[PDB]
Scaffold this active site. Structure first.
Site, short mmCIF file in Angstrom:
data_model
loop_
_atom_site.label_atom_id
_atom_site.label_comp_id
_atom_site.label_asym_id
_atom_site.label_seq_id
_atom_site.Cartn_x
_atom_site.Cartn_y
_atom_site.Cartn_z
N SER A 190 -25.06 -10.77 2.64
CA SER A 190 -24.30 -9.66 2.05
C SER A 190 -24.32 -9.75 0.53
O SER A 190 -25.40 -9.70 -0.07
CB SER A 190 -22.86 -9.64 2.58
OG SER A 190 -22.22 -8.40 2.30
N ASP A 457 -26.32 -2.79 10.78
CA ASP A 457 -25.50 -3.06 9.61
C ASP A 457 -25.05 -1.73 9.00
O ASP A 457 -25.90 -0.91 8.63
CB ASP A 457 -26.30 -3.89 8.61
CG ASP A 457 -25.44 -4.49 7.51
OD1 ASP A 457 -24.53 -3.81 7.00
OD2 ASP A 457 -25.70 -5.66 7.16
N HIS A 493 -23.31 -6.42 10.63
CA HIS A 493 -23.38 -6.89 9.25
C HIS A 493 -23.19 -8.41 9.21
O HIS A 493 -22.08 -8.92 9.37
CB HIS A 493 -22.33 -6.18 8.40
CG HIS A 493 -22.31 -6.62 6.97
ND1 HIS A 493 -23.43 -6.57 6.16
CD2 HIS A 493 -21.31 -7.10 6.19
CE1 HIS A 493 -23.12 -7.02 4.95
NE2 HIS A 493 -21.84 -7.34 4.95
#
Ligand SMILES: [Ca+2]
Length: 568
Positions: A190, A457, A493
């Site tokens: 991320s 995601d 994610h």
């Protein structure tokens, strides 16, 4: 760091304690380095959730203590752990969210793994990015994103903190061990994945091996997508929150999203050769799936309701809304402002009676609430865009964020991520973006990079990471010799979802950097195999543009019965 070492044995309790301010004469690369802890730690046994930690030296402190233009204190915190028995490798873990927290700094490798880098006898380091979620929590500037009010704190968050912390950790390693690390590794997901790409572009000699998962390499554009998905979903909302903003979380029930997922499976699942609940041929899926014309395979009827809403169809307003949201934001000229998103079965998923929340939490939020709670409507992501990435920053009460996303002007407001203003002398794309495909310096010194990204995601588009990788391959022929991308169907994610979301990325990274073994596939397993009604499912991750293909026989849940190949 240059003068003679303390007259004590290296890699020892004495050498550890000598690193603390006043306990020795170490010179740090940054003269504003303050060591607050230098303590010897006994070995820690394994737990249910963590591998055993070897005996080590723990060093923590801060760099560049100062006062921001907002009157708040700022500093770059670091925590470093150096094992008594060292494998000669240096390891830095990436951040998450908008950083601001200092982890245990044992060297997380992501992928749901139990082992830490410190458990593998790496020296490991972490940072908070230059701000502190407890200290830089300003109630008038949207809470923990409040660091955006200070220009230097922005630069620290974008690149400077990880540079300073890398230098400080390497200097401490050379002092404590008497020699520099043989190789250095960075792993993040991320925001941590953005940090990895930033390092490969801005500081190519810092790390030899980099893993960048779900990388937010265009993070200032996330809030633009968020305003777009908020406005796109609003026509399907039911009810209003306390400020009169439509309840985006009510636009789709969990059962509605499962209908969408099942229709995607009906159109796309077998395009890879096997109807196993996983869309491995994501390119063929994007060319084939349209929820406005696709069928609900369970009743043989159109997914989109012909008349009144039922549990087995989606309203035309719902279909229009999700199609627009997945298309991505555009200005009045129709020019894309970010990218589009891939239809994938991991938008939902059902394990037992538990619906997957890992996709919908980003654009919609939890259905069972009378308030908006999506990341992109009123949550951390929308707040971060207003205070951290728009220039000048736009602090406001938390109650006003959702309305601001509703009134977002796509001809005017997107320009704010390229703008400078007053003491904000760099744009957010300047200090936070990591879009460069000039990785020659990284490649030429032996650097290797593994990218990965879950197809479902909703924070960052896997298709946008793919587009970066395509640009990289065009700019650098033979790019697969040093950089490869592993997309993960069904995965959300950084973790979760109906896919094989768990994997050890550090072992193949070391193999690539140190033994020249490029990853032709990466073994993975599902953290929630209940999504498929099975006790376990293992699959190979394949280097872009390859996908996994069933060999035609054997257990469909066993990796050995699949191979990486070009799509059919
Ligand atoms: Ca399939």
């Amino acid at each position: 760091q240059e003068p003679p070492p303390p007259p004590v044995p290296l890699a020892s309790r004495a050498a550890c304690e000598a690193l603390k301010d006043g306990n020795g004469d170490m010179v740090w690369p940054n003269a504003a380095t303050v060591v607050e802890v230098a303590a010897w730690r006994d070995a820690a046994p394994a737990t249910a959730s963590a591998a055993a930690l070897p005996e080590h030296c723990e060093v923590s402190g801060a760099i560049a203590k100062r006062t921001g233009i907002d009157g708040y204190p700022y500093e770059i915190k670091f925590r470093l752990r150096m094992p008594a028995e060292w494998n000669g490798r240096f390891f830095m873990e990436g951040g998450s969210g908008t950083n601001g927290s200092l982890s245990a700094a044992t060297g997380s490798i992501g992928g749901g793994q139990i082992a830490s880098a410190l458990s593998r006898n790496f020296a490991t380091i972490a940072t908070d990015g230059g701000h502190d979620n407890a200290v830089n929590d300003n109630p008038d500037a949207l809470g923990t994103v409040a660091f955006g009010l200070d220009p230097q704190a922005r630069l620290d968050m974008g690149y400077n903190s990880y540079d300073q912390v890398t230098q400080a950790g390497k200097a401490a390693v050379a002092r404590f061990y008497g020699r520099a690390a043989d190789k250095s590794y960075f792993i993040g997901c991320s925001e941590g994945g953005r940090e990895g790409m930033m390092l490969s572009q801005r500081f190519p000699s810092h790390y030899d091996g980099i893993v960048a998962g779900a990388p937010g390499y265009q993070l200032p554009k996330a809030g633009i997508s968020g305003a777009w998905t908020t406005q796109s979903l609003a026509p399907a909302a039911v009810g209003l929150d306390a400020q009169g903003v439509p309840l985006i979380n009510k636009s789709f029930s969990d059962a509605d999203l499962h209908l969408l997922s099942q229709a995607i499976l009906g159109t796309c699942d077998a395009l890879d050769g096997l109807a196993d609940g996983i869309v491995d041929n994501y390119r063929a899926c994007q060319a084939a799936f349209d929820p406005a014309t696709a069928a609900n395979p369970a009743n043989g009827q159109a997914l989109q309701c012909v008349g009144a809403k039922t549990a087995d169809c989606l309203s035309p307003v719902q279909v229009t809304a999700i199609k627009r949201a997945m298309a991505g934001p555009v200005n009045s000229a129709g020019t894309p402002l970010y990218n589009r998103w891939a239809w994938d079965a991991g938008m939902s998923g059902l394990s037992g009676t538990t619906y997957n929340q890992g996709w919908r939490s980003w654009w919609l939020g939890s259905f069972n609430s009378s308030a908006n709670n999506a990341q992109r409507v009123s949550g951390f992501s929308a707040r971060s865009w207003l205070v951290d990435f728009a220039t000048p920053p736009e602090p406001m009460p938390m109650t006003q964020v959702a309305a601001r996303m509703m009134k977002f002007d796509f001809d005017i407001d997107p320009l704010k991520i390229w703008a400078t203003s007053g003491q904000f002398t760099q744009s957010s794309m300047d200090w936070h973006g990591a879009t460069s495909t000039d990785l020659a310096a990284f490649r030429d010194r032996g650097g290797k990079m593994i990218l990965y990204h879950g197809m479902s995601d909703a924070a960052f588009s896997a298709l946008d990471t793919a587009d970066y990788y395509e640009r990289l391959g065009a700019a650098m022929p033979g790019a697969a010799g040093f950089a490869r991308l592993f997309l993960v169907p069904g995965m959300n994610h950084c973790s979760g979802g109906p896919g094989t979301d768990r994997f050890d990325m550090l072992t193949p990274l070391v193999a690539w950097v140190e033994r020249g073994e490029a990853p032709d596939q990466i073994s993975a397993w599902s953290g929630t195999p209940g999504y498929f009604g099975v006790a376990a499912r293992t699959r190979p991750l394949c280097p872009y543009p390859q996908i996994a293909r069933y060999k035609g026989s054997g257990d469909i849940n066993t990796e050995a019965n699949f191979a990486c190949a070009a799509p059919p």
